[PDB]
Amino acid sequence: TRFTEEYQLFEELGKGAFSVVRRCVKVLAGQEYAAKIINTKKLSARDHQKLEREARICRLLKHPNIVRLHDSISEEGHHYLIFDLVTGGELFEDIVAREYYSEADASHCIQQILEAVLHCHQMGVVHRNLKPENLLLASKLKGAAVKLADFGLAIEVEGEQQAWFGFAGTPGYLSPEVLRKDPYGKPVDLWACGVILYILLVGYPPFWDEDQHRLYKQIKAGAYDFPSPEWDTVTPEAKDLINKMLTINPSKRITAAEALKHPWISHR
């Protein structure tokens, strides 16, 4: 079947629970891709549902700031999710290297992220796991576009209907409603956007603790601040957008659509 006869495998790009991500070449086309290779030998019925869900969600999303799924190939004992190759690496690595982004660069960055999240939300997809590791740069040329990646934890929602969809995400980026084990939906992504925007502007996260129990307490109480000296030169309107994203009550939290109309984004 198609992958084994048409594609050649090269170096590893990442790891998963029962998957690797490897660079591959479609040999006759001379085009390179990133292949998520899932070992499907004795997968549970639910694990088969989640693989199909990831494939369906990735096929659904067509956006300049979302990684394109090229193909979904089922072979004996192996499934291949074939994505466009993205060579700029994690947004995470670029923030660490540059320490922080200027407000102009941070605004441009979060604008692209919010456009990607807006599209997801319009198509009834909640990512649930937004973070700098899951945002890739299109090239190594500075000012390259950001691409939302890894919909392995993504869920399908029916309009604005919210529910307990289970405990999933990354500690530092988890919304209060997920940590309380309360019903949630699209707003969990805007909370994560708030954490990412905070990181962009000063190069460290708003919530952090060696003790995970204290981390979760600080998140649930929205106990973040803007310490000196890094926040001393940051505009009030940057702090305002962060505040509206890092709103504990998900009803009153800014939406993707609203965030894109905020003066700090739109007047620029």
């Binding site: 700098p132 590791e133 995400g169 990354t170 500690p171 952090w208």
Partner: peptide
Amino acid sequence: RNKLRRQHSYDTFV
């Protein structure tokens, strides 16, 4: 003091 660190994803509670 808060640090930018790579963190692992969960699909159930710790």
